[PDB]
């Protein structure tokens, strides 16, 4: 009932991304570098046939934290600077040369003959990593094998050997003296007693680790005259076994390159790109922040309608800058700025998209660029365009005509229009166009300590009915911040379905007009009806516009009386 001894592969490698991140870190600094891994032979996953060899960033540290019974296996890593070199190196020769170092050190101390090696190539442009593990297992001589038959009568020695290897973690083997006690390997004491134990990394039943080849090879060098002995394969599990062994037939045979997932002999590849893609990471974490508002707080809150809303902003000033900042925060991906201005040196202090160095550049194009600078995935366009004020004679008729046409094109193609402009008279032309094109409109107007926020979308528009919304008005800083956020909050609240029978939504009330005041810290809410005589509303004006086009626009701008008479307001 005797058999020849076979072997399982010594180790099973797992390299955590920290190892490659740490390997990358050193490729930017300065040959092989030393590695140290702690083996846990008490707890081995069932899925594995050998103890897992686990590498991290801390594996580069020469002395790291160990648990009590763990075994500090030592090794080295060879990093080639060109992929072609990595391929063309002979694997069978290289692992042999490592084994010679293992064989050499094994004669000095039999416990230093076990190690590992990692050949590697780091591609830092694609962040791709090629590695191959190997364990320098050597059978010396190549012809000499081991015949074994079980001897269960030795099972009483297992515990003695288990607790011995636990205590001495730097020792891979042990023998018996004349007193039947466990001690260190000695060539003298072993020839007499003929009992040798090996710490086993294999969980394969009656199949010891290939490392055993190394120990039996050193045994034959030290004690050439020992043909027959007893071999103990010691495991921290219940699967330890004793073997009655004999040697039966210089040249050394070196094996132990690690197979891959497919069982073929071939390197492993890890692709760490997508750590190189911060645009996608930022995109996903940002959306996931948004989703947290939905699942945790307001389950029926609709995010997708806000993300899919195309927003036109009229004016790039203080309001426009903050409004767009509150919009990209709410997940809005498409914003179009319209401004005729240029960034002044003073602008950045009240206008939150610009910097001092940005003076002299066109605002509209720059505001959009600034959004992409905050969050690189944004559909953001500036348009340099003038909005004609009513009650003024046209400065350039042909030019403003083009800009009139371009404004309607912009309004039609956008879902919601914000009126952020500087003055009351600048609101009229967009209010009319947005009426015709059936677009939802939010207004924001600034007074000294007061602000106004309302929705056009019957409710009726801005024009439907002291420092507020004037060209020269200088406002307290707080006013613009207040009005900007209330505008966006009104807009998001407006895109939500109304609860049955009431005005409210999932985000709460949706008032018609909000008028805030800084001195008393108070918010007023007022609801206004639509008016048949309004200059920007009335069907009389709407049908006048449809019929006469730009000619009705031109005359209304230069002569508001003509507009008031059409609407029947005078």
């Amino acid at each position: 009932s005797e058999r020849v001894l076979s072997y399982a592969p010594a180790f099973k490698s797992f390299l955590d991304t920290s190892f490659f991140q740490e390997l990358s870190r050193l490729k930017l600094d300065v040959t092989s570098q030393p590695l140290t891994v702690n083996l846990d032979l008490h707890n081995i996953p069932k899925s594995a046939d050998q103890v897992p060899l686990f590498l991290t960033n801390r594996s580069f540290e020469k002395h790291n934290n160990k648990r009590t019974n763990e075994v500090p296996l030592q090794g080295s890593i060879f990093n080639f600077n060109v992929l072609d070199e990595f391929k063309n190196l002979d694997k069978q020769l290289f692992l042999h040369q490592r084994a010679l170092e293992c064989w050499e050190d094994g004669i000095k101390d039999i416990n230093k003959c076990v190690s590992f090696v990692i050949i590697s190539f780091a591609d830092l442009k694609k962040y791709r990593f090629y590695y191959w593990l190997g364990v320098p297992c050597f059978q010396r001589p190549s012809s000499t094998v081991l015949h074994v038959r079980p001897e269960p009568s030795l099972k009483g020695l297992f515990s003695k050997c288990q607790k011995w290897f636990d205590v001495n973690y730097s020792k891979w083997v042990c023998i018996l003296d004349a007193d039947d006690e466990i001690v260190n390997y000695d060539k003298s004491i072993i020839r007499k007693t003929k009992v040798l134990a090996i710490r086993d990394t294999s969980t394969m039943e009656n199949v010891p680790s290939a490392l055993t080849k190394n120990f039996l090879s050193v045994l034959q060098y030290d004690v050439p005259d020992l043909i027959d002995f007893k071999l103990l394969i010691i495991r921290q599990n219940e699967g330890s076994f004793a073997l009655n062994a004999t040697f039966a037939s210089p040249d050394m045979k070196v094996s132990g390159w690690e197979r891959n997932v497919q069982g073929k002999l071939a390197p492993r590849v890890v692709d760490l790109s997508s750590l190189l893609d911060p645009l996608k990471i930022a995109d996903q974490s940002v959306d996931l922040n948004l989703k947290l508002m939905k699942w945790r707080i307001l389950p029926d809150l609709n995010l997708d309608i806000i993300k899919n809303t195309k927003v036109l902003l009229l004016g790039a000033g203080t309001l426009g800058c903050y409004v767009s900042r509150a919009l990209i925060a709410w997940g809005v991906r498409k914003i179009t700025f319209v401004d005729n201005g240029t960034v002044s040196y003073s602008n950045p202090v009240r206008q939150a998209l610009y910097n001092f160095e940005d003076a002299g550049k066109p605002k509209a194009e720059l505001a959009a660029a600034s959004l992409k600078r905050i969050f690189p995935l944004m559909d953001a366009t500036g348009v340099k365009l003038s909005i004609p004020m009513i009650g003024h004679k046209l400065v350039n008729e042909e030019a403003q005509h083009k800009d009139f046409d371009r404004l309607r094109a912009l309004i039609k193609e956008h879902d919601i229009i914000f009126l952020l402009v500087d003055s009351r008279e600048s609101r009229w032309l967009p209010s009319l166009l947005s009426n015709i094109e059936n677009k939802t409109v939010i207004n924001a107007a600034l007074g000294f300590d007061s602000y106004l926020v309302m929705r056009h979308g019957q409710l009726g528009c801005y024009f439907c009915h002291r420092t507020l919304d004037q060209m020269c008005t200088v406002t307290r800083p707080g006013v613009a911040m207040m009005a900007s956020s209330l505008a966006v909050e009104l807009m998001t609240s407006l895109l939500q379905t109304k609860y049955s029978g009431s005005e409210t939504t999932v985000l709460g009330d949706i008032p018609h007009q909000i008028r805030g005041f800084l001195h008393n810290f108070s918010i007023l809410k007022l609801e206004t009806p639509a008016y048949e005589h309004c200059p920007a509303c009335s069907p009389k004006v709407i049908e006048a516009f449809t019929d006469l086009g730009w000619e009705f626009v031109k005359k209304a701008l230069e002569h508001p009386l003509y507009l008031e008479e059409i609407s029947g307001l005078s």
Partner: protein, 131 residues
């Protein structure tokens, strides 16, 4: 849960071989300090269907990282997902960032009294993956 109470239950949980005797785990390891547990798991059949149905990709394996959040003084489960591909006709593994992570089931995804850790494991891990 106190830090040290969590440190003791993490080492007991590890030493019980409960994860090592799981069918899914390729590897189980504690970090440099004892503050954490890295679980490398084999993808369940149900996950493999999902990622191929949604992302049209093959799953390689899943890394779960059991950590202690010192902000909330509570455990935090971190998740990394890996893809199966090839380069030269040999297997390549790739860290992926799922276009939809939620329907599939330091860059990591994150999940949003003496029996504490064992319960929290059953709820936050064993529930969806299965034991």
């Amino acid at each position: 849960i106190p830090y040290q109470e969590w440190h003791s239950q993490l080492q007991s949980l590890y030493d019980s071989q409960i994860f090592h005797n799981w069918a899914l785990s390729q590897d189980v390891h504690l970090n440099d300090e004892k503050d954490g547990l890295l679980l490398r798991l084999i993808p369940t059949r149900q996950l493999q269907k999902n990622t191929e149905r949604i992302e049209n990709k093959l799953l390689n394996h899943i890394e779960l990282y059991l950590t202690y959040s010192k902000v909330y003084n509570e455990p935090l489960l971190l998740l990394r997902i890996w893809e199966e591909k090839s380069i030269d006709g040999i297997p390549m593994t790739k860290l992926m960032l799922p276009t939809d992570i939620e329907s599939l089931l330091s860059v990591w995804y994150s999940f949003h009294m003496s029996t504490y850790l064992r319960r929290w494991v059953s709820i936050f891990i064993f529930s969806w993956l299965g034991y």
